[PDB]
Design a protein around this ligand. Structure first.
Ligand code: NA
Lengths: 306, 306
């Protein structure tokens, strides 16, 4: 029993974290086989960051300008190139601790584990969801750039996020490992215009099912609604529309509890309209939206048949 | 910026987790040097669990009754002994991945990372706090026994918790790595109600300081309180007493913000008497008590002088 925000065990990723220094800037990089991946703004001076000509800045650099440290050992850089906002440093040594891995681009609403690093050294691990406005609500200090987000899918590490920036509102922005930003953001010091954030409805419903599986049932009502009526109410509360695909992926949880998805929607509608009665659900006084249906299935052992 | 429940990176502990099987019971063990530590109730049948005499149960066991698997590799058991509620299995091979480590017994209010494991395989990682009633509000399923809690001090893993049991209320209980339970609990199927859980006041104050450092200030007021008048209020709401030692450990945060501890206590007194009136603090609608003063110092970069 119990329900907690849980991250993947981070060991396979820890063995890939290195420190990258260029000039006086130090941040983290990801060493997979004979390539280190890191944010390209490691090459910028303060002046460059106001209006960076990255293509010209990278040409001006030489391999000897990149200091790559893997624990106590310096790795020799023997080539460099750029893919969108990620710098790729070729090193003369392949990482023997490279895990089976893939680079994936996640969708809003999806969750992943963040390995926060400083000075090439892993510091903490926490679960995050990609917000509908493509930001993440993380905890990061200076030196965290290059920290990565990932999921473990069977025997493979699926890297989905590289940290690049904190917006002035205190939320975070980054790229996939092909160097493309999530959201309309750029790696420079300039106005960055995040969309209004919204609540991830399918995840809230998943978490209400987790509550029921754990015996927290007070908020259930016997009513059921239509998908269209639910969406009319929920969008007044800045919730994302619920789609038939969302209904379908909640199916394992509706099966386990015997509570139809549109019956749970009517329970959520009443919570939004009338509030949480001064009560908690799974230890929270607010509706939680950073747990996906699969996060709930895995933590509650829902997928067994007996 | 940001404030998140964060666990330590788990890799140093992942390298120590093994599977231990006795009869048809399988659970997890912790392999350090040439010893594997696990809950002693791995030797019990269903009948035994109702009323075990562990010394007598262990006399009839031989080294060959213990199957220890590290990956797809069996470890030869060459001795077995019991220390309080932990079984120690001597194996013929020292774990080459043993980190620097120590065994510590933590206090209520203290936080630690849990590496939840199944079949000797790490599954997820999360932060939790020891409750004043010596229970932990964890997330554990059948097969999690043997999972461990820990803190890291740069290079040293301080092991503080081994998981043994879920009470019928859904909370968890376990031992330190010397086998002594936290709290009045026993490794037997028998009634064992936990004491009343109370709120960890010093941690709530630390979290209010985290909020101020992150820009949430709406709850600060011009009221003042003595320590005793604060405790007279807090105890009415099942908060632990705040002592002068707690006031001192909040020193770094009262220094960073310029807000005296007793002035923050006056803010807490008003929140307790009146609620938050439709507001949130650091994204929560309740007063959070599972972050220690040092958790706040570390995420909020408080321990620098410039
Ligand atoms: Na309903």
């Amino acid at each position: 029993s119990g329900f907690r925000k849980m991250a993947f065990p981070s060991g396979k990723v820890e063995g890939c974290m290195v420190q990258v220094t260029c000039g006086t800037t130090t941040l983290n990089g990801l060493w997979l086989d004979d390539v280190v991946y890191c944010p390209r703004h490691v090459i910028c001076t303060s002046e460059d960051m106001l209006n960076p000509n990255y293509e010209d800045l990278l040409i001006r650099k030489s391999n000897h300008n990149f200091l790559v440290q893997a624990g106590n050992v310096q790795l020799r850089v023997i080539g460099h190139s750029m893919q969108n906002c990620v710098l790729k440093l070729k090193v003369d040594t392949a990482n023997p601790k490279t895990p089976k891995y893939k680079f994936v681009r996640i969708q809003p609403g999806q969750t992943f584990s963040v390995l926060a690093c400083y000075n090439g050294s892993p510091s903490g691990v926490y679960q995050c969801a990609m917000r509908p406005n493509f930001t993440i609500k993380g905890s990061f200090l200076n030196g965290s750039c290059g920290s990565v987000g990932f999921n473990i899918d069977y025997d493979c590490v699926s890297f989905c996020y590289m940290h690049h920036m904190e917006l002035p509102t205190g939320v975070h922005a980054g790229t996939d490992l092909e160097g493309n930003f999530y959201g309309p953001f750029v790696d420079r010091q300039t106005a960055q215009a995040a969309g209004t954030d919204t609540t991830i409805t399918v995840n809230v419903l998943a978490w209400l099912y987790a509550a029921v599986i754990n015996g927290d049932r007070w908020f259930l009502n016997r009513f059921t609604t239509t998908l269209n009526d639910f969406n009319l109410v929920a969008m007044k509360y800045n919730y994302e529309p619920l789609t038939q695909d969302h209904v379908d992926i909640l199916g394992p949880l509706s099966a386990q509890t015997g509570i139809a998805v549109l019956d749970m929607c009517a329970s959520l509608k009443e919570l939004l309209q009338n509030g949480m009665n001064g009560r908690t659900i799974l230890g929270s006084a607010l509706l939680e939206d950073e747990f996906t249906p699969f996060d709930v299935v895995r933590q509650c052992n829902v997928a067994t048949l007996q």
